[PDB]
Symmetry: D2
Subunit: 267 residues, 4 copies
């Protein structure tokens, strides 16, 4: 197993189409022992994760709650046993209020909404590293989920700005994590048909926002030299597991693109 004997915390599961659900499944297939964290709807998340190949403890974590963050390391240690530390951490958490996405004009998002989205989607990558690095082993790995924000695009709007901030945060987290012998990297995935993303394509955020996202998805598979299947998160999950493994030991502060190669092609 690629991750045999490793203890890995995975955040971000909310449905069976969550990218983090497939990260967790593949990590368990490869021998990892998991601790899961979930936000708000813990009964739902427990029912969802009962379908993973192995039972895993589930801890509550709202990344805006400083009490959850202050207690997290102790709750993880209780779950994996005293004297044991984590080898890996997966941040698969993102949110932007509806005013910051969709057909709602870019200029009309109030800063309170933008700040909440940047808190959950970017600052919390530093928050989780701060909480968990003291209980991580040398040779460990922190991985977060990214969507390439180097160019503007329709509808993503303020979430694009949040991802730009996240990429910057990751480079600073690498500086801190390096003192522990730990790597920090992001995986920039192509579009994946989660429940939330299917709802937006179906017009949850306005019709032409849905139309624009559908056009973006189609161009992605066209550009990608090996194609891109938005209905299959397994290639993204495998890439996260590659970064959690010992096989990219000299990569940190960096971004790995699991996007079919689409970002390397103009058309």
């Amino acid at each position: 197993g690629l991750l045999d004997g490793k203890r890995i915390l995975v955040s971000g599961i909310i449905t069976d189409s969550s990218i983090a659900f497939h990260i967790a499944r593949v990590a368990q297939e490869q021998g990892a022992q998991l601790v899961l964290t979930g936000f708000d709807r813990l009964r739902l998340i427990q029912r969802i994760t009962d379908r993973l190949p192995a039972k895993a403890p589930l801890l509550e974590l709202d990344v805006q709650n400083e009490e959850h963050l202050a207690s997290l390391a102790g709750r993880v240690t209780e779950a994996i046993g005293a004297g044991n530390k984590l080898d890996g951490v997966v941040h698969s958490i993102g949110f932007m209020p509806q005013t910051g996405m969709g057909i709602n004009p870019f200029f009309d998002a109030p800063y309170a909404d933008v700040s909440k989205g940047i808190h959950i989607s970017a600052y919390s990558y530093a928050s989780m590293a701060k909480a968990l690095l003291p209980i991580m082993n040398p040779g460990g790995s922190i991985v977060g989920m990214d969507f390439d924000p180097s160019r503007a695009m329709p509808a993503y709007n303020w979430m694009t700005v949040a991802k730009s901030a996240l990429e910057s945060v990751n480079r600073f987290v690498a500086r801190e994590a390096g003192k522990y012998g730990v790597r920090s990297n992001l995986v920039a995935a192509g579009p994946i048909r989660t429940l939330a993303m299917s709802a937006i394509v179906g017009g949850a955020l306005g019709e032409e926002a849905g139309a624009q996202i559908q056009l973006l998805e189609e161009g992605w598979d066209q550009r990608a030299p090996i194609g891109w299947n938005m209905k299959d998160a397994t290639p993204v999950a495998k890439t996260v597991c590659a970064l959690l493994s010992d096989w990219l030991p000299a990569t940190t502060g960096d971004i790995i693109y699991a996007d079919g190669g689409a970002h390397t092609q103009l058309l």
Copy 2:
């Protein structure tokens, strides 16, 4: 004159070493008619700007104050006369609380502080564009000040994250501004010895933060193929005026580097 007959709003003057003070001076030397905006210490700013080559109206603008922003376009129109519009806007505004910079550990900045810095330094670029685009002429130009955040560095810490967010915001502002025939760009300057920056090199934010910034300054002049004079903001001011002029008419959503070429060289 490069800017003859143009009406340009310039924010960000607080002392005679402010980058915006030199932008304003060079723009007036080149024939522009200015409206100035200032934050908080308006009596001080009026005294400072009395030393500009020409008298200019000074308007109060705290970019965190929605009432200041809601009234700004009307106050500008009163200052330049009904039926007149702006040809240019300069955003030269930045702030990050001390916890987000210096020797203070990156992980110890509370989100309230980071969010305030991102509000002032990044979101407000969109806020000012929203306020002023309705009173801008086709062919107009919005310019903001940047510090290349593509790599992490010591001490800049959360201000680096704010600049990453600003670069992303600029690409979305270009989308909106294009509907008015207006360009939006950033100037990424090398280090400039403002009053605040001299204080930090002198240890206002901790000793080794000051030591690290001094090392960064020295490496900049070494890397720059044409050298870099941190005591001379005129090359930065001229670059801003180039973007305000009609001579870069097909550049938008972009970043122009006024840094001596340092970012193009590894050592």
Copy 3:
């Protein structure tokens, strides 16, 4: 005039739709005194440049001819007068044999053909700098023409590789030019309907190569926040003149994008 009193060498005119023809016209409109260089068909080029606003001396320069390059500085000095030096140099030269472009498979271009294209399109930027820097004034400016090669695309094929090499060459030319007080930069233009480019869209290099280039052109105007007019080279010419002027004095080794902002937008 933006370039009043400046002496500027302009290469690359072959027809009245050459980008260099419009660079030369705008530079003369702005007060520059020009020396022109032309390749092979000098009688044709003289007839073309008789239509410029002012008469300019025309010198022969095949950038693959070491004798032309060894004599160039002396021939320029004869044209502008002893004791006078150049303030600006424009490289607007590119060529790739047909096997390296179009529907002809990427793998089927022989290296002899690729090497000729890289010689003319990339190495010659260093060759011209070597020849002309000894007769350039401090504060001078070298500008070359680029087409953004950071992503692969259909049909451009080996010319894309040549532009990647050119961008690298430019960063090294900046190191050398800096010792003379001279800047070196590229302008990355959007697509322009030169005679050669119209012929390729019309199928000179194969039908689906023409089809692919037409699709690339259409997406460019769609992406550009201020639009893109492939029939109008004046915005590109003005950007070159901006870099030749004194108004971007701290930019070197760099690339300025005169592309409507298209490269800053995904769709």
Copy 4:
């Protein structure tokens, strides 16, 4: 084993400090069956590779020899058996004549020398893909070795330009390889003390070239958040094996940085 059952061709071994020697060793440790290719000194290379964990067939390949390239696929098939195909290809080949590196001025490299270096170091990545893709399995992987050329630096000179060309070639090879279900990527390594590199630091290419490279090496370990050991190629070799494996299945046309994170940090 990470590469259990995979058939992989590895080029570029010349001494026991070659990066390709360590790629080959790690690949064999992980269960791969290798075919090796060597240039010119085949008796030496056979003696060197006798020290690998397993015996591997050695084929002659001068990438400038079209007869070697035309026969390569048939010689590989003879070595692995009819009906068998390759799963992986490693390009670890580079050369630039001495005039294109070191204290020898950048402008003094003749194009004949530069063209030879670009032939061996960049064009040959396309040459090898053309030769070997017809005998590669779907799901296969082509990997080449890179040194980040996005910024100029002392001494690397024309080899930097060759690496810029290689990165561009890789994006086009990905387009071709995708039709076979094959990925193409580069690994950008930090500096490694090969025999050639130790000789240059010792002044083989001039004293201040050696001095400049030693300064570059020292800054690399300082910048890298996890450090950088130029005497240990194993982290680079493991990264190549990661790309040869099935664990980065959605990455192509891309560059993975095995450099300690140094390129993500300014200082």
